[PDB]
Design a binder for this molecule. Sequence first.
Ligand SMILES: CC(C)n1c(Nc2ccccc2)nc2cnc(Nc3ccc(N4CCN(C)CC4)cc3)nc21
Ligand SMILES: [Cl-]
Length: 302
Amino acid sequence: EAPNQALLRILKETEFKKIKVLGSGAFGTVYKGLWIPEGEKVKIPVAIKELREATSPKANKEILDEAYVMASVDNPHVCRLLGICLTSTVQLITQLMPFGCLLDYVREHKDNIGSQYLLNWCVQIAKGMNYLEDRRLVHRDLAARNVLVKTPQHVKITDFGRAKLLGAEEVPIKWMALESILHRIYTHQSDVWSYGVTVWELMTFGSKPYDGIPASEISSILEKGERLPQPPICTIDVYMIMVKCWMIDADSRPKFRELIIEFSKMARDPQRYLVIQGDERMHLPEEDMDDVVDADEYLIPQ
Ligand SMILES: CC(C)n1c(Nc2ccccc2)nc2cnc(Nc3ccc(N4CCN(C)CC4)cc3)nc21
Ligand SMILES: [Cl-]
């Protein structure tokens, strides 16, 4: 096992300003903000995630594990941590994704969303996921809600709070592989099953999974051999791939690098694998912004 030499960057609260609340849930809230690095003359659009005024020690121990992971990843399809702030309670700063999470995005734009885009996201997510596998990381919470849109073309994975290294002792039931539900067993392959669900979410345009069914129920349903329905826009090819992600024997399930390859192919003839009405028709998208630099553009030594 190699040494992790990721640099953890420490930021002063003076370096950045919160502007809106992007989302508020549970313990903590995420802000849209601007970060200007010290003496750099660049402004970077950022999200800032912080917990409640309650500063309880256990919660911090959870946010710092997350930061740790996000600090340790470098892929175009994975969200990375810019740095952290220690001023009262910990905050995580990372690059902002303007269009929000993918799940919201498909629901909002279904009528302008096309086969090429859906296939591309699939390729992209599988890429981010393959990277994590390379780094031996199990996301353990992959959902459409945890994919973020920089742009319609570009998406990245996020929410590494539940992330573990593979083979480590250390709840979203619906996205969970059966082995995980029965035995709390997680492997990259468990991760793969979740990918299949995420894909199902996009093809059904944000439809809820096993809607109307209680989670306690779900283990039984899966046990019986039940699985998610084939989406209307889905060819048998595409659905066939999803179904492979949901096999009892996890070694029979596809590898993320296979998934990249198969969806990659489909993306060269997108109309053959996804049937959507008016597919051809569809197209998709504070005073001084001169100095605005995206995080992807902004780079540091190392
Ligand atoms: C809001 C959460 C999902 N988030 C975290 N979370 C996060 C997790 C760990 C560390 C740092 C951030 N990083 C984020 C980075 N970027 C964005 N962007 C973004 C998020 C939400 C929205 N909207 C606008 C449309 N609304 C209908 C729904 C809310 C627009 C843009 N969100 C992030
Ligand atoms: Cl759930």
